[PDB]
Amino acid sequence: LLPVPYTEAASLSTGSTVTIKGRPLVCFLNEPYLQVDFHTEMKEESDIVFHFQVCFGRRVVMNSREYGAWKQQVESKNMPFQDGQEFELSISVLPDKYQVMVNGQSSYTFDHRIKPEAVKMVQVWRDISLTKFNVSYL
Amino acid sequence: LLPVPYTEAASLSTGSTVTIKGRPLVCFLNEPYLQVDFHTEMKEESDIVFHFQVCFGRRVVMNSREYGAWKQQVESKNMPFQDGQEFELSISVLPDKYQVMVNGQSSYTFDHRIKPEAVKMVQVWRDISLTKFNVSYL
Numbered sequence: 001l002l003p004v005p006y007t008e009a010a011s012l013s014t015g016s017t018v019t020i021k022g023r024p025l026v027c028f029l030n031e032p033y034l035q036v037d038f039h040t041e042m043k044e045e046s047d048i049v050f051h052f053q054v055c056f057g058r059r060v061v062m063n064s065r066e067y068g069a070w071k072q073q074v075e076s077k078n079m080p081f082q083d084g085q086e087f088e089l090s091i092s093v094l095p096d097k098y099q100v101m102v103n104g105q106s107s108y109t110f111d112h113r114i115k116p117e118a119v120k121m122v123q124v125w126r127d128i129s130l131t132k133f134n135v136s137y138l
Numbered sequence: 139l140l141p142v143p144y145t146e147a148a149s150l151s152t153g154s155t156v157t158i159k160g161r162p163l164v165c166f167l168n169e170p171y172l173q174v175d176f177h178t179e180m181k182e183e184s185d186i187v188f189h190f191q192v193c194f195g196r197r198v199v200m201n202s203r204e205y206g207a208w209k210q211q212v213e214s215k216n217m218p219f220q221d222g223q224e225f226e227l228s229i230s231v232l233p234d235k236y237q238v239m240v241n242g243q244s245s246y247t248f249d250h251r252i253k254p255e256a257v258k259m260v261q262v263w264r265d266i267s268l269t270k271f272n273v274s275y276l
């Protein structure tokens with residue numbers, strides 16, 4: 001297990017992938033969350049280029065936080081995460097957007113509001129155990 | 139620190155108090171949660187007599203879960219929890235309702251939908267550290 005909340009310094013550009021392997025701590029009936037935030041600084045109060053929040057069994061919200069203010073929330077009812085199971089989450093930086101893979105299935109996209117080069121830190125937190133976190137590049 | 143999620147077997151009646159001392163894991167800007175659930179069984183999928191969820195800095199929701207279904211949500215914008223600080227949460231069983239004290243201040247009430255004698259387990263979880271959990275009686 002990696003500690004949760006998990007914070008890692010990171011640089012992203014086109015071709016960067018962020019891969020997370022984890023498991024919800026409790027059954028989907030109890031609505032555990034997962035959050036992944038791409039921050040502009042190492043401090044947790046810093047702006048968020050890309051905010052990804054799963055309410056397991058219900059929905060996903062995505063947003064940015066810019067100069068401390070939450071922007072236009074995007075919502076998906078797409079729920080490929082399986083009750084009780086380990087997940088593999090992969091977030092890829094494409095030229096125009098983030099691609100979110102769940103268990104090898106394209107599940108969510110989010111157009112760049114801020115250049116991904118603004119990211120200095122990824123935080124993974126809320127009601128999961130974390131087995132793997134990797135930032136990679138092709 | 140007590141492990142989180144924290145689960146303790148419990149019996150409640152009029153005069154029972156549940157006291158929790160904890161601290162949010164992150165700043166209120168990032169909206170950490172605290173949840174306290176009074177369950178009818180030791181298993182986490184069991185019905186919830188009393189569901190208390192803090193979104194720190196934003197709101198509190200309270201509900202019951204009966205035969206697996208969430209009932210009428212109650213919402214309060216009362217927020218006596220302090221950014222960055224340890225809290226003391228005390229939930230008292232009165233004849234007709236739960237009384238929720240935060241840092242010695244009456245903050246929330248919730249009329250009994252199910253007799254508090256139906257409770258067999260308390261779960262404390264989401265984005266907190268936990269220093270104390272006690273079930274007591276006067």
Ligand SMILES: OC[C@H]1O[C@@H](O)[C@H](O)[C@@H](O)[C@@H]1O
Nearest residue numbers: 053061062063070073168169
């Ligand atoms: O957790 C913080 C939440 O605050 C809301 O105001 C935002 O619109 C959401 O996107 C975000 O998930």
Ligand SMILES: OC[C@H]1O[C@@H](O)[C@H](O)[C@@H](O)[C@@H]1O
Nearest residue numbers: 076078099106107108109110
């Ligand atoms: O933004 C959400 C969309 O992202 C796409 O890349 C996914 O493949 C679709 O399933 C989904 O509708």
Ligand SMILES: OC[C@H]1O[C@@H](O)[C@H](O)[C@@H](O)[C@@H]1O
Nearest residue numbers: 074097098108109110111112
């Ligand atoms: O923020 C824009 C994103 O929002 C989604 O609603 C669209 O379906 C995605 O294709 C797009 O990348």
Ligand SMILES: OC[C@H]1O[C@@H](O)[C@H](O)[C@@H](O)[C@@H]1O
Nearest residue numbers: 030031191199200201208211
């Ligand atoms: O976390 C579970 C949530 O599900 C909602 O449907 C309920 O009305 C809330 O009271 C509860 O907080």
Ligand SMILES: OC[C@H]1O[C@@H](O)[C@H](O)[C@@H](O)[C@@H]1O
Nearest residue numbers: 214216237244245246247248
């Ligand atoms: O249900 C909420 C109410 O509970 C009362 O016991 C509190 O003292 C009030 O501040 C609050 O309006």
Ligand SMILES: OC[C@H]1O[C@@H](O)[C@H](O)[C@@H](O)[C@@H]1O
Nearest residue numbers: 212235236246247248249250
């Ligand atoms: O569920 C009923 C509870 O809801 C609140 O709106 C009331 O203000 C409380 O006094 C009451 O105990």
